[PDB]
Write a protein that binds this ligand. Sequence first.
Ligand SMILES: [K+]
Ligand SMILES: [K+]
Ligand SMILES: [K+]
Ligand SMILES: [Mg+2]
Ligand SMILES: [Mg+2]
Ligand SMILES: [Mg+2]
Ligand SMILES: [Mg+2]
Ligand SMILES: [Mg+2]
Ligand SMILES: [Mg+2]
Ligand SMILES: [Mg+2]
Ligand SMILES: [Mg+2]
Ligand SMILES: [Mg+2]
Ligand SMILES: [Mg+2]
Ligand SMILES: [Mg+2]
Ligand SMILES: [Mg+2]
Ligand SMILES: [Mg+2]
Ligand SMILES: [Mg+2]
Ligand SMILES: [Mg+2]
Ligand SMILES: [Mg+2]
Ligand SMILES: [Mg+2]
Ligand SMILES: [Mg+2]
Ligand SMILES: [Mg+2]
Ligand SMILES: [Mg+2]
Ligand SMILES: [Mg+2]
Ligand SMILES: [Mg+2]
Ligand SMILES: [Mg+2]
Ligand SMILES: [Mg+2]
Ligand SMILES: [Mg+2]
Ligand SMILES: [Mg+2]
Ligand SMILES: [Mg+2]
Ligand SMILES: [Mg+2]
Ligand SMILES: [Mg+2]
Ligand SMILES: [Mg+2]
Ligand SMILES: [Mg+2]
Ligand SMILES: [Mg+2]
Ligand SMILES: [Mg+2]
Ligand SMILES: [Mg+2]
Ligand SMILES: [Mg+2]
Ligand SMILES: [Mg+2]
Ligand SMILES: [Mg+2]
Ligand SMILES: [Mg+2]
Ligand SMILES: [Mg+2]
Ligand code: NA
Ligand code: NA
Ligand code: NA
Ligand SMILES: [Zn+2]
Lengths: 255, 68, 88
Amino acid sequence: GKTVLSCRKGNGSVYQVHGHKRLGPAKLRILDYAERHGYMRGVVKSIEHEAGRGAALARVEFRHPYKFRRVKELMVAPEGMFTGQSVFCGQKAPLAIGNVLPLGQITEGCIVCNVEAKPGDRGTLARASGDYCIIISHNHETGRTRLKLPSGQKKSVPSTSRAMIGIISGGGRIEKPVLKAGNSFYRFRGKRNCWPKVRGVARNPVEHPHGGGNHQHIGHPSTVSRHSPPGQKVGLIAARRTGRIRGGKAVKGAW
Amino acid sequence: GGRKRPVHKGITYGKPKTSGVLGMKLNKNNQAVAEQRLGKRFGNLRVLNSYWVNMDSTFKWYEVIAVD
Amino acid sequence: AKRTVKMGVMGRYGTRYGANPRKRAKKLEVSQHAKHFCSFCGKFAFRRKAVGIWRCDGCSKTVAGGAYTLSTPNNSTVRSTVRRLREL
RNA sequence: CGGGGAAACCCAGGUGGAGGCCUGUAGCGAUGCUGACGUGCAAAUCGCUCGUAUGAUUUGGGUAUCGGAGCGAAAGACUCA
RNA sequence: CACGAGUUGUUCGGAAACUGAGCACAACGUUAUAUCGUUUUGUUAGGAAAGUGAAGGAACUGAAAAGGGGCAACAGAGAACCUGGGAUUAUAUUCCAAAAAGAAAUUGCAUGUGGG
RNA sequence: UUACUCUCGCGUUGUUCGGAGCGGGGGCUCAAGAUUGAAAAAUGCAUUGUGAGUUCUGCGCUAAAGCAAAAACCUGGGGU
RNA sequence: CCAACUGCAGACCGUACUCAUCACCGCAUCAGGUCCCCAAGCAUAGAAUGCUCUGGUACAUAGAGAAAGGUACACUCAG
RNA sequence: CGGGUAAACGGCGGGAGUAACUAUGACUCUCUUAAGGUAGCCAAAUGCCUCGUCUUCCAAUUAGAGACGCGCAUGAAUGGA
RNA sequence: GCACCGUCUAGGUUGUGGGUACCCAACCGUGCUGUAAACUGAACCAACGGGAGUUCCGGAGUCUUGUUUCGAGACAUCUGCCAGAUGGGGAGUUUGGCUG
Ligand SMILES: [K+]
Ligand SMILES: [K+]
Ligand SMILES: [K+]
Ligand SMILES: [Mg+2]
Ligand SMILES: [Mg+2]
Ligand SMILES: [Mg+2]
Ligand SMILES: [Mg+2]
Ligand SMILES: [Mg+2]
Ligand SMILES: [Mg+2]
Ligand SMILES: [Mg+2]
Ligand SMILES: [Mg+2]
Ligand SMILES: [Mg+2]
Ligand SMILES: [Mg+2]
Ligand SMILES: [Mg+2]
Ligand SMILES: [Mg+2]
Ligand SMILES: [Mg+2]
Ligand SMILES: [Mg+2]
Ligand SMILES: [Mg+2]
Ligand SMILES: [Mg+2]
Ligand SMILES: [Mg+2]
Ligand SMILES: [Mg+2]
Ligand SMILES: [Mg+2]
Ligand SMILES: [Mg+2]
Ligand SMILES: [Mg+2]
Ligand SMILES: [Mg+2]
Ligand SMILES: [Mg+2]
Ligand SMILES: [Mg+2]
Ligand SMILES: [Mg+2]
Ligand SMILES: [Mg+2]
Ligand SMILES: [Mg+2]
Ligand SMILES: [Mg+2]
Ligand SMILES: [Mg+2]
Ligand SMILES: [Mg+2]
Ligand SMILES: [Mg+2]
Ligand SMILES: [Mg+2]
Ligand SMILES: [Mg+2]
Ligand SMILES: [Mg+2]
Ligand SMILES: [Mg+2]
Ligand SMILES: [Mg+2]
Ligand SMILES: [Mg+2]
Ligand SMILES: [Mg+2]
Ligand SMILES: [Mg+2]
Ligand code: NA
Ligand code: NA
Ligand code: NA
Ligand SMILES: [Zn+2]
């Protein structure tokens, strides 16, 4: 046979990110001495849109702590942030929308976004538009904090990790039907070469395990083992169950 | 470690007798390999001999004597 | 006189994409082209530029919020919760 | 902007110029005559007729991905007859 | 077919001298084998890659500033000149000579004049 | 500036603007043109008035699509 | 040091011709293919189509000439 | 070994008796499966027999349409209408 | 057992112009001069003081049984080597004869 498309995508080539129009990575400030001991105050200068991203980005200007110059930061903007607003980041920052505080200083039951999984990572959780995390509890003896993630799972992180107060802007995006093939074309133009999609049963046996036959059909079960080699692991990978879900929907993911 | 045969995706052709990819061994020892590496890198010297100096889980170290 | 009975702005689609999908998109289409109230200044002059980006004609101020409306209902709840926790 | 109504709203006349909208050049294609030619003008062309023509549109230069492999809105199509 | 001729620029196009999709020298690593890999998400390399402003008494000597050296657009950025000619067999915004047919703009270095 | 007092006013072909300062009087400035002259008649060949077309320019700047970067240059804040 | 004035000097490569029913690819001076700029008058909605001033061309083997049968971006036919 | 899962691959029955003319069986026994095809639809691009049977269309229709259904071998995201 | 290494500290408790309003010492605290909904100013190449024109200190705390910091941690895909399952993802090969 020949190589399957899912395996071919791993070489890179014509399947990489279209990033020419993007403004750069979005991240928090660097966890420095001022952030660890006091606070820093910056000003929001502009709010902008980036190709391929549903949330708005904010440019925030700070003063350099050691030299005579200005520093510009690009961050994911929570809903309600406006130009001219003051942003406080550090240990002694007050509790308000847009500020960045250590998790140990945030009251239980609060809504946060742009959460650091590890201290100094500059934000890796709850970044897509309309998403957020919920603080559950603190453990002062262990120095840890419990969080509920957008997926519904629960995670424990060190209390030194930082977070921003509020929810990510741009929520409600997926409620509007697309209605046209051209709209999907423009939607994926800013992201990558992954559209349109061709069904596996519409291909030939040389290219896909589902191809061939005098009827369009899969001749074997479409649930495949976790141990299947690349080129064979297509379909429903290591599925615990199939079919329409009756009753409550369980939380997805590993134990 | 042992030598891995450099074929695309670990696929061999021909008789089944020549199908091993991981269990083959190089017909030349690591001391000779180290001497050849040094000699190819520094072409203005002459290699005389070498000896074993140390070893760990991943690496072996030899000392090579050269003359000008 | 009134030019359509049921579909106001979706009339540009003719007879194509189906009644229910057109109906669901109409509510969000109307919202994203209307003028919203500005708490700064006092005018109904907030217009969406790009998804999640709103600019005031009078204030000349830019605010981040909402894909198709200026403020999401979930945002209003969060502001009240944060204010209450701060006052503790 | 005219008329009606207690109110919610209803009827009529203009303005404006939306749409993977319609007729139709250039462009991009190739339905039928199973037409011409079939030691040809041509190792796939010619005539009339025909599809679409503001968009998932057409096109120049540059640049990236290949032979147990590449690419493919998927015909085992295409990769210098 | 044979013999003999013809393409003239401070300003036109390129380069000197930009960056883009991108390439891959050095460096490091790997391979029995470099003819392999990394090399723009501000950016090489376990990584000591800055070689001269002022000075100070006329050549020296050394402070400052993180992230090596290049290439890739004759349709993107950039770019100081126009008309007339009776001036060719063939070139011209390129040739014309003191009444330059003439009228300009711009770069480098020097000399007066004025001001400081 | 009792301008919107009780149908407020200005304005476009057109989807609007004003106590966060409309309209009127008098001014400052920018962009595109017009006019007077030098060039320029010494050249060229053997005239100055209206309608139609025409993207330079101005009218400031669909979208889950929101429209490259750098060299070079300009101005300012400090200091001398 | 700065402003006009003035004096001198302004280096390198390209530049003929073609761009196509004869100058390029298709074995060829092949009814195929090949990117860009300027685009007059009348009819008319008009870059449709028909004719015309400027510019260009008369190059495509020809002469004589009512057989049958053909091809045609050529027609007509009583009931 | 023991649990779950079909919008996973897939599957979804036969025999006889019986109503005051006859016919047909609402009804009753019997063998059996993991379950025995539900709502719908049809001589349909899926029906062998087959040019099925009735009506309509014509002077005359192996064609067309509307009905009927024991459906060789229709049927529900292998998606049905 | 006693010495030495081996010490400092923010803050808290107890009619117009130009100026004054301390020190205690002890505990708490642990390197602290700014904000406590928000709605766009500025900040660099030291002023000053002291010891012996030009130095050296302070302003700007000192020290290092030494790790850049944070999170794990002798576990771990962390490295190499043996061993067993699974494995059309892939390779090689085969798929008798007679015969109206
Ligand atoms: K694609
Ligand atoms: K199949
Ligand atoms: K098929
Ligand atoms: Mg990338
Ligand atoms: Mg097929
Ligand atoms: Mg296969
Ligand atoms: Mg199908
Ligand atoms: Mg399979
Ligand atoms: Mg090895
Ligand atoms: Mg072999
Ligand atoms: Mg060797
Ligand atoms: Mg059409
Ligand atoms: Mg034919
Ligand atoms: Mg086939
Ligand atoms: Mg010749
Ligand atoms: Mg010659
Ligand atoms: Mg990279
Ligand atoms: Mg680049
Ligand atoms: Mg570099
Ligand atoms: Mg250019
Ligand atoms: Mg030039
Ligand atoms: Mg010529
Ligand atoms: Mg008024
Ligand atoms: Mg020429
Ligand atoms: Mg031409
Ligand atoms: Mg010819
Ligand atoms: Mg030709
Ligand atoms: Mg007319
Ligand atoms: Mg024409
Ligand atoms: Mg015409
Ligand atoms: Mg001929
Ligand atoms: Mg002729
Ligand atoms: Mg004839
Ligand atoms: Mg007739
Ligand atoms: Mg049934
Ligand atoms: Mg049937
Ligand atoms: Mg008939
Ligand atoms: Mg029928
Ligand atoms: Mg089902
Ligand atoms: Mg079926
Ligand atoms: Mg550590
Ligand atoms: Mg095989
Ligand atoms: Na970019
Ligand atoms: Na093999
Ligand atoms: Na229109
Ligand atoms: Zn406002």
